[PDB]
Amino acid sequence: IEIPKEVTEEGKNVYKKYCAPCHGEEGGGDGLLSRSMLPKPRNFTLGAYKFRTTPSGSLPTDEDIYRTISYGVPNSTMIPWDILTEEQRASVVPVLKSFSEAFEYREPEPSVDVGLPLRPTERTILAGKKIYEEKLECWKCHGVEGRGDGPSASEQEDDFGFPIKPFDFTTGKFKGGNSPTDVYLRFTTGLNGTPMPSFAKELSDDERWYLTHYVMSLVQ
């Protein structure tokens, strides 16, 4: 439904009861249970969201945040919050936005246009294999099979100073969603706060569908 811009008392309470234990009382990702948690809960104060429909460096839209709250983040303790009502999940969006000054000064960039997903073929997969292994050498961080055991894997770090070793995605549980549109979105938007950049500039729309098709090919 409609996500408010205003902060409400209900929004404070929902965050307090269901989000503060991990993300912290002030959204610093420093709840008590964050000391022993891996991956670390998001520090909302930086305004850096991994999963957006906006280009690299931009803030998330209010709908981007509501989507992540509803769907959750696989390969982490970030469960789906479908257990909460539509309004409850929408009332905490401004609470998360109030943790970062960047939301008050800049406006989120326009959402990218997905377009029509290209038909996967033997041709598109091999064109993505070429990009993955030769043109951009994604096996550096992710490995030849995408297991997350490449040479540069163990040394990767957040912009928050935390180790972010790329998880094995051959299970098919992508953090932003396991849809072909979801994976294409990640390559078109980039993951803010992580060494995983946007390839909207290095590759065309068609080439990122080629790359998406090969990435899905690595799933079991």
Binding site for ligand HEC (CB under 6 A): 33, 39, 77, 79, 132, 136, 138, 140-142, 152, 156, 164, 166-167, 169, 174-176, 183, 186, 191, 194-196, 199, 211, 215
Q: Which is nearer to ligand HEC, 79 or 114 (CB)?
A: 79
Smallest distance, Å, CB 36 to another protein?
4
| CA–CA gap between residue 14 and residue 6 (Å, rounded) | 15
56 binds, among ligand HEC, another protein, none (CB under 5 to 8 A by kind): none
Q: Which is nearer to another protein, 92 or 203 (CB)?
A: 92
18 binds, among ligand HEC, another protein, none (CB under 5 to 8 A by kind): another protein
Answer yes or no: is 138 a known binding residue: yes
Smallest distance, Å, CB 51 to ligand HEC?
7
Answer yes or no: is 51 a known binding residue: yes
Smallest distance, Å, CB 63 to ligand HEC?
17
Q: Which is nearer to ligand HEC, 47 or 166 (CB)?
A: 166
Confirm if 152 and 140 have CB atoms less than 8 A apart: yes
SS3 readout for 129-140 = HHHHHHHCCCHH
Q: Which residue has the tokens 């909302």?
A: 44
The count of other CB atoms within 10 Å of the CB of residue 82 is: 12
Confirm if 212 and 183 have CB atoms less than 8 A apart: yes
Smallest distance, Å, CB 182 to another protein?
18
DSSP state string for 185-211: HHHHH--TTSS----TTTS-HHHHHHH
Smallest distance, Å, CB 32 to another protein?
5
Contacts to another protein by CB under 8 A: 17-18, 21-22, 31-33, 35-38, 40, 72, 75-77, 79-80, 83, 149, 151, 154, 162-163, 165
Q: Which is nearer to ligand HEC, 79 or 144 (CB)?
A: 79
DSSP state string for 92-124: THHHHHTT-THHHHSPPPPPP---PPPPP-HHH
Residues 168-197 as b/e (b if ≥16 CB within 10 A, e otherwise) read bbbeeebbbbeebebbbbbbbbbbbbbebe
Of 47, 211, 220, nearest in space to 139 by CA: 211
C-alpha count within 13 angstroms, C-beta hemisphere, residue 130: 10
Q: Which is nearer to ligand HEC, 32 or 106 (CB)?
A: 32
Residue ranges of the binding site for heme c: 19, 22-23, 42, 50-51, 78, 138, 141-142, 175-176, 196
